[PDB]
Amino acid sequence: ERITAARGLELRCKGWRQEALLRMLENVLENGENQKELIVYAALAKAARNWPSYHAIVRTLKELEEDETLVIQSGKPIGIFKTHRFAPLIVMANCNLVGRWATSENFYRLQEKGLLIWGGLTAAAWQYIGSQGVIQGTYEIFQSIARLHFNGSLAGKFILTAGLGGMGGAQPLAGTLAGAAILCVEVSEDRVDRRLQTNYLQRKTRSLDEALLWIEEAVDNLHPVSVGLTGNASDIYPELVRRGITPDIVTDQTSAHDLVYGYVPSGYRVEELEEARANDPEQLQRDAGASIAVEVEAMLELKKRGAIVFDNGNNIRSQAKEYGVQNAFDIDIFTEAFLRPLFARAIGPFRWVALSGELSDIHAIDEFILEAFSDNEVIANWIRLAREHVPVEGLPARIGWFGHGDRTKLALAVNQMVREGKLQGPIAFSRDHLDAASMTHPNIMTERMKDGSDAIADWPLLNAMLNCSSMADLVTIHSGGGGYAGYMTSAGVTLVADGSTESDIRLETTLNNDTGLGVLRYADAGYEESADEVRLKDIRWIKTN
Amino acid sequence: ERITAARGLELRCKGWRQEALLRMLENVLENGENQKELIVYAALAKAARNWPSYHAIVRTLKELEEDETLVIQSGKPIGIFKTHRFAPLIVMANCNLVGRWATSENFYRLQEKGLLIWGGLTAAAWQYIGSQGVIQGTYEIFQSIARLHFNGSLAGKFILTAGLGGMGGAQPLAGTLAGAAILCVEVSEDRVDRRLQTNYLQRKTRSLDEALLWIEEAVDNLHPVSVGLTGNASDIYPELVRRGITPDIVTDQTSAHDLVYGYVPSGYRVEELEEARANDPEQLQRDAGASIAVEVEAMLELKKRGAIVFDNGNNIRSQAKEYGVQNAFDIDIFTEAFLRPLFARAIGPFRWVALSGELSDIHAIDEFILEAFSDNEVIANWIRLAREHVPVEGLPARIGWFGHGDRTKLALAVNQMVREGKLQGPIAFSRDHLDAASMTHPNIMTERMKDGSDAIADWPLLNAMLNCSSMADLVTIHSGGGGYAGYMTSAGVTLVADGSTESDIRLETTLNNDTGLGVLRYADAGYEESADEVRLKDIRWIKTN
Ligand SMILES: NC(=O)c1ccc[n+]([C@@H]2O[C@H](COP(=O)([O-])OP(=O)(O)OC[C@H]3O[C@@H](n4cnc5c(N)ncnc54)[C@H](O)[C@@H]3O)[C@@H](O)[C@H]2O)c1
Numbered sequence A, B: 001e002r003i004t005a006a007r008g009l010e011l012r013c014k015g016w017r018q019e020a021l022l023r024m025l026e027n028v029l030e031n032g033e034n035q036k037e038l039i040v041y042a043a044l045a046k047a048a049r050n051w052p053s054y055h056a057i058v059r060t061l062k063e064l065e066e067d068e069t070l071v072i073q074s075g076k077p078i079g080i081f082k083t084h085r086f087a088p089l090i091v092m093a094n095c096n097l098v099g100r101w102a103t104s105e106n107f108y109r110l111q112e113k114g115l116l117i118w119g120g121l122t123a124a125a126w127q128y129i130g131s132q133g134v135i136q137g138t139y140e141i142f143q144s145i146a147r148l149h150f151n152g153s154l155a156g157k158f159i160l161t162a163g164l165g166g167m168g169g170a171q172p173l174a175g176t177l178a179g180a181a182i183l184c185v186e187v188s189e190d191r192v193d194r195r196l197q198t199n200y201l202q203r204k205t206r207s208l209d210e211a212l213l214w215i216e217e218a219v220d221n222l223h224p225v226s227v228g229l230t231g232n233a234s235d236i237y238p239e240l241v242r243r244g245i246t247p248d249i250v251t252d253q254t255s256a257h258d259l260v261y262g263y264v265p266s267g268y269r270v271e272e273l274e275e276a277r278a279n280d281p282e283q284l285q286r287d288a289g290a291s292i293a294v295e296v297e298a299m300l301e302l303k304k305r306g307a308i309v310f311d312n313g314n315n316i317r318s319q320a321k322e323y324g325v326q327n328a329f330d331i332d333i334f335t336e337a338f339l340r341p342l343f344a345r346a347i348g349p350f351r352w353v354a355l356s357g358e359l360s361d362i363h364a365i366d367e368f369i370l371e372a373f374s375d376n377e378v379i380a381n382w383i384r385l386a387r388e389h390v391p392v393e394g395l396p397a398r399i400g401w402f403g404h405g406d407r408t409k410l411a412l413a414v415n416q417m418v419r420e421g422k423l424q425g426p427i428a429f430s431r432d433h434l435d436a437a438s439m440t441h442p443n444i445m446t447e448r449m450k451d452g453s454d455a456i457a458d459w460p461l462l463n464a465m466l467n468c469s470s471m472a473d474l475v476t477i478h479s480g481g482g483g484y485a486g487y488m489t490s491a492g493v494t495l496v497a498d499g500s501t502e503s504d505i506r507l508e509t510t511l512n513n514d515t516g517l518g519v520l521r522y523a524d525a526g527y528e529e530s531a532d533e534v535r536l537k538d539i540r541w542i543k544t545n
């Protein structure tokens, strides 16, 4: 029987802050792409190191007092420590390796030995809310491209992408919300069907000709459509190049970061991957890397024929370069090219979860946002769209990109709504780690920083320490695993709006500092949007020169 | 005019917790090996990124309120954030680079660009107390060797080492406190004289024959002696091999971790190093690496002739291997070979500083320890020796290795002594980062862990987050710079015992968790001393299997 988050108002823990974390753990497994292996998303991002660790985490949370801290180490609960009730209930650090040892080869060996797990960004910290977590980011990428290259509209524009997994599955809905005709190549029919049946996906086919006919009809009419094509991206993309078909936009969101558990090489059936991992994992990686190289060569050709081509944050260019595509980094990254003006003001992927399990709670917050942020036409547009079109996945939840001060405003209003019984139960707040002071990754978040600080990992470490100092409920530091090993370090944070007045202080303190450090990180690198935000919001940026 | 720590009881800041950190900053510069370059020790471990950063840190500390946190990033003050008064006053993260970019070459380039500094372990967190900080560790190494190989006594035993810098300068006194005849090779006459005049060193010479005559007379009589020999270790060590002279113990504590600013190659004069760094830094590194290789070859030969040979934590074996010494790691590391049974109980380099500047404060704490820990003959022996023989360096301070619960006991007694006026002024507590949950370094602290977890850097990240959650005054996360780039990540903590009852809670909470996580880190790796300590001290170690 599949794990699901507890619904309703019956506490299993000593309080609602503890219960919230337990339900978020259950919720990432409920929305997980392979719950049975503790895998939440991204092929091998796990919620805990193993089932023994999971059960001991669950036991510990049920007995944890508000003035204690549980320490979790690469997904394994280690000990319980006395702190105080304005300190995190959990601090965790997942898959951190000292630099010269931070290689994929070392990662697999240590995971085999039982010593670590990769936590993804939001898997091991239990902050994943389903595909919705990434859908506004992708939609904002598509809209930024529209503004930059297509007069503000993707109507009649053709997007090609691949991957309909935990995160990739958001792309068809992001595409059609932006008015685009979007073709998503996916190797697993199982995944195609899942997205069809949750209505992230409109149409499916096994025929490329049929898919292109549908795309053509939509483009010609300026209608949106999403098509899932069963196939391998390293076969389909070169074929479009052969046919001289250049989409207007091309990206990829396959699991290219991991050549053992992620990217399916050309000529392999999904059914034989386990077999291949067991017998000859080395050949499988070589085959996956060669197929990624073919796919990116096709992307590069599409780029030269005029497509807007970009990396959607999966190290696909890094992999392609390793397997011989020397100009792979001619392809843009979505951060530097499209979203960095948002990050520079610490506008980022803020999210919240209705721990009661009641969708009416999300809808009440939706209505609050439309009323209280009505001068913010971006968030107002997004919330209208999400309320109408994003289905419930696990616990009702909402993604909503907010910047400095706005996160705090929302969370304080919601906490009061919990306190006043306008919401049925407490609300958990969190975010992706793809946020201003909380991620360092030279080929994703921090590629080509203005000051060259691409590799500086101080910032997420600072974000974690400051958030611990700011009364958050859960704080985490992650580093890359699998093919992300050695590429990134990030930090996450969870807050529980349980209605109490003491939570008001925690929410205010953490959220102002979580975004505040984000603004200063980009201000330090010389971004003028950040310097403007500092003045607008009276952030205390220290001047030295 | 040289920077010195303020003495006396006049506050320059808004409170004594803030003043304590300001004085510790001044104090590491006062005891610094090259204050003029902000360099505290270890060739390039700096207290701040640059003088502009230093002045802005000083200004900020003078105005910082107890409910605020200053964020420092690789030695540069970034911003001031509202937290609460049971949160750190400072969180800092120094010289952290994502793994694939954590190389010495990247480090130098980024330091050149003005983007980072190496913080050492205790330099950028202002936790260095002078040479005393390391002297008990070295003495415990020598005593462990004595127990293992020489019937409990180094009387009549010959120790050969090199390096009389910030940390290396402790070796002659550690040697003679243990009864040994110790020869210290040092290239700079300036350094030799400094140690002579602070009485860390008994005798100096420029003649190897004279040095060996002195060593021989002492050995023969079972007397202790310390001799500083002006010379290059890569010349002297092979010469002893040539002469068939095998000391009983051989180590090195030169700055072998950095081939640009540290290790002086054979045939270079110290006077020309600056010139060489400017013109041809690449040749200088090659020359330094070749000379380290020669020195370690000599060490390896001495080992085969029966010397107890070990690496004293300066990556000398790593460097030697890189420059061709394939069996360099046949030489023991002091952690795994001698001190790990202490680390396994979180016994570690705890230290405290009399912020009043009054030596009588240290002496009162000394007397307290002798009375309150009298069943602990190890600490009782050490304190007697240190009070008698360790000179004051900068602010009066004391090193004293204590384990779980004992650190807390000491700090609570001292805080009460501050409160009751038995001490003139507040006391700062800290430690080296060479401590149980606070250091990851596969070729120093965590070489050859029982469970193979040598590379896992989760633990210092956890130590920092938990200490932030535990009401510490300053928390830091550092990673390696120079030749340490990619090798290590560590965490430090500072507490201010200012006498208040609220500080009692902070000191208790932080110290129990700083050592408590340390015990659990070694317990997790399977060390039986740790499992014993857990039971003895009722540490809440979670069981999963
Ligand atoms: N680290 C970041 O900053 C960041 C941010 C957002 C997304 N992501 C990345 O998004 C990528 C995907 O995330 P996920 O959660 O969707 O992964 P997931 O593994 O759940 O799904 C990956 C999908 O790709 C399919 N696939 C694999 N090889 C294929 C091929 N050759 N052709 C077609 N389809 C193929 C798989 O069948 C699966 O459905 C990952 O690399 C994740 O890291 C990363």
Ligand SMILES: NC(=O)c1ccc[n+]([C@@H]2O[C@H](COP(=O)([O-])OP(=O)(O)OC[C@H]3O[C@@H](n4cnc5c(N)ncnc54)[C@H](O)[C@@H]3O)[C@@H](O)[C@H]2O)c1
Pocket: B033, B041, B042, B043, B044, B134, B162, B163, B164, B165, B166, B167, B168, B169, B185, B186, B187, B188, B191, B231, B232, B233, B234, B253, B254, B255, B256, B257, B262, B263, B264, B265, B266, B312, B313, B314, B315, B434, B444, B445
């Ligand atoms: N990272 C750890 O875990 C740890 C712990 C303790 C000590 N240490 C290391 O101890 C080593 C020294 O620390 P420090 O603070 O003494 O450095 P320091 O640079 O102040 O002094 C180094 C001394 O070595 C001398 N020297 C350089 N090359 C020489 C040569 N070829 N022959 C003789 N003398 C030579 C220099 O003149 C200087 O006096 C460093 O590598 C530091 O990291 C490291």
Ligand SMILES: O=C(O)/C=C/c1c[nH]cn1
Pocket: A042, A120, A121, A122, A127, A128, A129, A133, A134, A167, A432, A433
């Ligand atoms: O939105 C999430 O939960 C995760 C986003 C992400 C991207 N890459 C890894 N995790």
Ligand SMILES: O=C(O)/C=C/c1c[nH]cn1
Pocket: B042, B120, B121, B122, B127, B128, B129, B133, B134, B167, B432, B433
């Ligand atoms: O005792 C100190 O202050 C520093 C010890 C240390 C060892 N290596 C780097 N710092």
